[PDB]
Design a protein around this ligand. Sequence first.
Ligand SMILES: Nc1ncnc2c1ncn2[C@@H]1O[C@H](COP(=O)(O)OP(=O)(O)O)[C@@H](O)[C@H]1O
Ligand SMILES: Nc1ncnc2c1ncn2[C@@H]1O[C@H](COP(=O)(O)OP(=O)(O)O)[C@@H](O)[C@H]1O
Ligand SMILES: [Ca+2]
Ligand SMILES: [Ca+2]
Ligand SMILES: [Mg+2]
Ligand SMILES: [Mg+2]
Lengths: 160, 57, 57, 371, 371, 126, 74
Amino acid sequence: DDIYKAAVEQLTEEQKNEFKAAFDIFVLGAEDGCISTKELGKVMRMLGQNPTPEELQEMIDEVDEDGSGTVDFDEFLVMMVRCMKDDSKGKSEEELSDLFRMFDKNADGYIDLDELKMMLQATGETITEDDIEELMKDGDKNNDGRIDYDEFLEFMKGVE
Amino acid sequence: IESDLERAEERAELSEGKCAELEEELKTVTNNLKSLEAQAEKYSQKEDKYEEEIKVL
Amino acid sequence: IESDLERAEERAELSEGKCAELEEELKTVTNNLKSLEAQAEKYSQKEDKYEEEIKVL
Amino acid sequence: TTALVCDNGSGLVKAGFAGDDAPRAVFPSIVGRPRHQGVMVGMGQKDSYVGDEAQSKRGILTLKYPIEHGIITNWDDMEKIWHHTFYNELRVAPEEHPTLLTEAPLNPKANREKMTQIMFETFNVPAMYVAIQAVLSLYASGRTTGIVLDSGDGVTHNVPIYEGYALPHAIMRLDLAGRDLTDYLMKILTERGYSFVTTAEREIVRDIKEKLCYVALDFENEMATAASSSSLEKSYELPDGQVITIGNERFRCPETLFQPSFIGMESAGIHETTYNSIMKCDIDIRKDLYANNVLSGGTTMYPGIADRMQKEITALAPSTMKIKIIAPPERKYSVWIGGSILASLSTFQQMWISKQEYDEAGPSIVHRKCF
Amino acid sequence: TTALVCDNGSGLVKAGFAGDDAPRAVFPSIVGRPRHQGVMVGMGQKDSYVGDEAQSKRGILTLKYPIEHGIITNWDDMEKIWHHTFYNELRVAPEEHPTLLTEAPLNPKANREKMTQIMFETFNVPAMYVAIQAVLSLYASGRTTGIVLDSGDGVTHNVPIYEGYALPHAIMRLDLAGRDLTDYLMKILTERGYSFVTTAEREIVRDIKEKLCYVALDFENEMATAASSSSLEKSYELPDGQVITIGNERFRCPETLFQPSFIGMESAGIHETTYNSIMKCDIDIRKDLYANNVLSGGTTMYPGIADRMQKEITALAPSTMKIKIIAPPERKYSVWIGGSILASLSTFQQMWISKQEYDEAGPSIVHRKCF
Amino acid sequence: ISASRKLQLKTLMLQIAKQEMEREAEERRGEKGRVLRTRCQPLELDGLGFEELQDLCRQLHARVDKVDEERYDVEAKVTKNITEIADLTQKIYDLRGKFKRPTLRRVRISADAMMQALLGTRAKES
Amino acid sequence: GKRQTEREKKKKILAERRKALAIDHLNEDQLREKAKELWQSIHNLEAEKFDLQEKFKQQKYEINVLRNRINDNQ
Ligand SMILES: Nc1ncnc2c1ncn2[C@@H]1O[C@H](COP(=O)(O)OP(=O)(O)O)[C@@H](O)[C@H]1O
Ligand SMILES: Nc1ncnc2c1ncn2[C@@H]1O[C@H](COP(=O)(O)OP(=O)(O)O)[C@@H](O)[C@H]1O
Ligand SMILES: [Ca+2]
Ligand SMILES: [Ca+2]
Ligand SMILES: [Mg+2]
Ligand SMILES: [Mg+2]
């Protein structure tokens, strides 16, 4: 899933052509071009089984930035990688707790913004201050500025 | 809207609790003031009596 | 639910106003009580001096 | 380091670090096991909720105080209460802090020895000291003489002190206190129809007593007035609605203090045991004790008691002496404030019972020079 | 492996694998032998059509429910229903799947013991567990407190729960349910001329009740309005034509729930047995039960019941408490959704009655610790 | 950065933190070994008659008993800490678990697995 | 007997943690052997003690973190 999402985001010819051929096969009644909810359900029914459409609708609108009943590109990628769970949610609880306690040099059970940004500098990866703000706001559940282990895991979801 | 209603309810509850506490505090301090005022009146009377006693003795 | 939420928020606002008024009352009465405590201490000193003079006489 | 000024009490445990103005954590001392069966799985249901947690789940618990009258009747529960107090309400391990417990006068020795043995073996404190609950209340008033009436919730005791020299032959300990007043109020409420029986509803009756009851200046006049007019009937809303109206039960509950014949006790009220405690003292320090009568403890917070007691003592005492009753507004925590002051003194720093001393003489060290 | 969350019920058997949102197969629990003679040879006529097959051939059958009021009165038919449910509606052999049956409160012991004996001897499951039908409905709501009124088709029971601790002394089980409402509707339809007698036509009356009846907000005003205007008369087409018009029978059929004197029952309605069930609880958890009243079961799907019940309880309850009635849209399958959630828990995985345990203690194991 | 890009950013963050933990453990082990070397000091054996060796043995046994009592104390502390952290972890789970029951579906097979079941071996990438 | 249980626990701590010392029957050379064995025993015991201290420190750190997270969530 984690490999597949990244691969299909900027895929070469092969599996994107496979998706296109899947749609070409799906034209037996459903031809909306951009997969809507009704066409998605029609495709799933013509497959040969009667699954609960709740998973289909969660795929089609839940992870979406729009949730309009239609299928986007990265949204379809999330749909494809969502059947299984291969992305290890940003490490494991033991690893995350160890990295947070070494992160919590102040041993206060929370990560202040100052040590947060200092660690971010220590990362050395690509810098994005808007992404820094997004991560902080993910840690702004009670909006106390500091980020506990709960919110730390919250924005560590799917980190591969 | 349900979450909004829950937040409104909890805010109202906190405000009412603080109001009750303030009521209790004001009651106590006002009772203290009343008692002290009565004591002060009695003390003025006692002071006049003591001065009279000083003069006569 | 929407109507109930609106009523709850209005109740919370009213309670906050009441709490502010109670705070004002509490501070005023506290100041008055301190003033009367000082007055009573002066009363006590006067009584002490009068008692001593009575004993001497 | 800093000292832990704990104060077991009976009804409210008050604790905090030495040198402050108010206790850090104040919470009822009750340990309540659940009594029903429990059907939800994985709800995380514990086997005993202690402290202030069991005052919120009291609907399905059976609260039971571990301290009856000063003495401790259930040592396991008391150990649980202490463990909670140290670890969750203060979050300071006891391995690095001296402790200063408090104990009522004239209590059984075994209680005090077991207390020190627990503090030294289980919690493993560096050094602990046990002090009489009235001397601290005298510290807090900033006096050095005076006769202090410390009417707690478990036991009411009356220790006279002069110039720092306590008079051991004049301590009058009486076992009427707030708990008996709660039971008597719960018993006289039945005269209107309200029946409280469960050990959880005792807390509701306690709240009624705290918020409504007051001490009458003159008992017969109040009984006559409440029986003609209706200006006294104050109402109160139970935890579920159904408001109740308390009539002349308001000043009849705390009147038991001055007439212990109401609950069948033989002894004289708190207005006459103070005068008796004074009269046992020497003839030359009675004026100072008359002028410096100190009130403390929770139960002396009834509105209008500092006037009733003064009127009664003035009736008993000779007409020439001046009767003055010291009633500080911080009455409830007076013992703990005094404990903080005592623990903060430099002269007191060598009176602690050091652990090596306990190892050499056993728990009976507390009765020795280190009192 | 996965667990089978079966739910016998009385009127509709709901089953499905643990961990889903809705039961996989829902079908009436009726077993109907043919009653006429039969002349065609080789037609392949069976001796008993069960489940949803007998709702299509009901014209020549005599349908008879094997569960009267929660209890099971005809064990052979119930065994047949279970066999059908396992093999044809789910197609999973029971030799490789744990089962989680459900049972009404206060049912006879012998029923439960026979149920477990059948499941262990005939179908030979690995492990089965029996749960009270109301705790599951409380699971599905995602709460942990609240008093749940589970008005099924067989029996209406009202189990209050607080903080996961069920109160066994406050369960009020009443035997009025959907079946009695069907019979009463079939009895009052005769006032217009329509006579339904056959056990097959009871199904038609049930369909009329489901599609047309509703609970009136105020009974007398509706009775007065339906007797003057004609805005209520809704028509319905029988399985052969000859449409019928239901007048004030619409809200008189489900009114029996709030006035069981209509069908001659003495007890009080579902609006007053909930208040009585609350008042038996302790005085400190009544506010939470008032605020978290939960509805479940099929019969609570009448349009307009969540308002009538709230109005009635608000009339009975003290004016200060807030009365809230939780009526999720997935009411019918609430018990089964809760059953799926409970079977999917890791903490619950060791509560099953393993087969070796049954072999050692006999069928009476169900009353023991493994409840 | 893209969503995947910031996921890789946090991945590098976790890698840096893991390296920091590795060096922390290495320095912990080295410094504790040095500290024990300071305490656990080797002593001479040769050149000593019977009495000196017997006295050394007595001292060693006394120190063994003392440090064994101390080890019991620290082990009891460790056990208490284990119990307390287990209780805190369980409380954390209670506050943020239990009611987290997801949509357990046996019909939404894996996209590769479901596609194979409905088509044979069509799905072979995922 | 719970108080008796803890008292016998600490008594066994004071007694059983001490082991059997036998060095006088061991000749000067065997005495050196016994001294070496006791030396290794005490050094390993102090190693265990230090490891216990460090593990307790880490456990207490995690306890602080979890309790702080609880405070945040409440
Ligand atoms: N404001 C109040 N008015 C009347 N009674 C009170 C008040 N506060 C506390 N009490 C009574 O005093 C008791 C608490 O006494 P306290 O001084 O805490 O006892 P202890 O000496 O054990 O600490 C309570 O049980 C209550 O009955
Ligand atoms: N939509 C509806 N409106 C009114 N009544 C209904 C509706 N659906 C079901 N019922 C009644 O509820 C009964 C089904 O209840 P159910 O919850 O299946 O019982 P059980 O607890 O045995 O499963 C039916 O007999 C029917 O009378
Ligand atoms: Ca969309
Ligand atoms: Ca930090
Ligand atoms: Mg006290
Ligand atoms: Mg049911």
